[PDB]
Design an enzyme around this catalytic site. Structure first.
Site, short mmCIF file in Angstrom:
data_model
loop_
_atom_site.label_atom_id
_atom_site.label_comp_id
_atom_site.label_asym_id
_atom_site.label_seq_id
_atom_site.Cartn_x
_atom_site.Cartn_y
_atom_site.Cartn_z
CG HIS A 1 -58.94 2.21 31.79
ND1 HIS A 1 -59.85 2.46 30.78
CD2 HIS A 1 -58.55 0.93 31.63
CE1 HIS A 1 -60.01 1.37 30.06
NE2 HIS A 1 -59.23 0.42 30.56
CD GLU B 1 -56.07 -1.53 29.06
OE1 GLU B 1 -56.44 -0.56 29.75
OE2 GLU B 1 -56.84 -2.47 28.71
O1 LIG Z 1 -61.32 -2.30 29.65
C1 LIG Z 1 -60.21 -2.44 28.93
O2 LIG Z 1 -59.15 -2.20 29.49
C2 LIG Z 1 -60.23 -3.26 27.65
C3 LIG Z 1 -61.64 -3.47 27.10
S1 LIG Z 1 -61.56 -4.25 25.62
O3 LIG Z 1 -60.59 -3.60 24.78
O4 LIG Z 1 -61.16 -5.63 25.79
O5 LIG Z 1 -63.02 -4.21 24.90
#
Ligand SMILES: O=C(O)CCS(=O)(=O)O
Length: 231
Positions: A79, A151
């Site tokens: 992450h 992400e």
């Molecule tokens: O925990 C993540 O991977 C995304 C959190 S958020 O961007 O949705 O606030």
């Protein structure tokens, strides 16, 4: 047609209550990931059969073994902050992924570019280098146990979501690399999830894109609408 979607979440008692009472009327794998300290309660409390619990970041043979023994079969690795804050390199993440798969885990492996990398047009090289490191430590059969979470670091917690075009372009680029380097059979079954400022309002539009198979989001009441958006 798309593989089974996934919705993963990354006042917890009220939150577990809400999830437990939610009817989910389609096929989707829901995941609640949490730090070691909250696992025991989450497993004791979360009983919805379309949900599984996931650990995060374990990198020790004995720790993984202990998790499996306790009934945890999923784990999130690599992450954003692991890389930009803690210092896990592409290869450290890849080794953790390989170890987890070897210990019998389903692995949500996270990749993604920073603001500068995006702005300087290096999204593709960065993201593909990250996943190539992961693929280097796996054999073909292992991908049955892998889920990719894309992400953009600039979308995590910033309130700035990728547009549907941005998300789709990234997912397609990832899937095309998997298809060509690993195999089109693996590519077609691979779940690639989008994460970064997903909310109840924007999720369903994102899910409509060809190569989006679900979401990674925060553990919040609106996660319920994110689950519903996976169709
Ligand atoms: O925990 C993540 O991977 C995304 C959190 S958020 O961007 O949705 O606030």
């Amino acid at each position: 047609s798309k593989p089974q979607p996934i919705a993963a979440a990354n006042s917890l008692s009220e939150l577990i209550d809400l999830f437990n009472s939610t009817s989910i009327n389609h096929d989707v794998q829901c995941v609640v990931a949490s730090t070691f300290v909250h696992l025991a309660m989450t497993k004791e409390r979360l009983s919805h059969p379309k949900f599984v619990i996931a650990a995060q970041n374990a990198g020790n043979a004995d720790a993984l073994a202990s998790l499996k023994d306790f009934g945890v079969n999923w784990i999130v690795l690599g992450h954003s902050e692991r890389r930009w804050y803690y210092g896990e390199t592409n290869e450290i993440v890849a080794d953790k992924v390989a170890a987890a798969v070897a210990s019998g885990f389903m692995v949500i492996a996270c990749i993604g570019e920073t603001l500068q990398e995006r702005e300087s047009g290096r999204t593709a090289v960065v993201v593909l280098t990250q996943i190539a490191a992961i693929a280097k430590k796996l054999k073909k059969a292992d991908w049955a146990k892998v889920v990719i979470a894309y992400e953009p670091v600039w979308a995590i917690g910033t309130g700035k979501v990728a547009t549907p075009q941005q998300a789709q372009e990234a997912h397609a680029l990832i899937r095309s690399w998997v298809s060509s380097k690993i195999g089109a059979d693996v590519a077609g079954e691979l779940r690639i999830l989008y994460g970064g400022s997903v909310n109840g309002k924007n999720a369903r539009t994102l899910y409509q894109q060809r190569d989006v198979n679900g979401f990674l989001a925060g553990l919040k009441p609106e996660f319920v609408d994110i689950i519903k958006a996976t169709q």
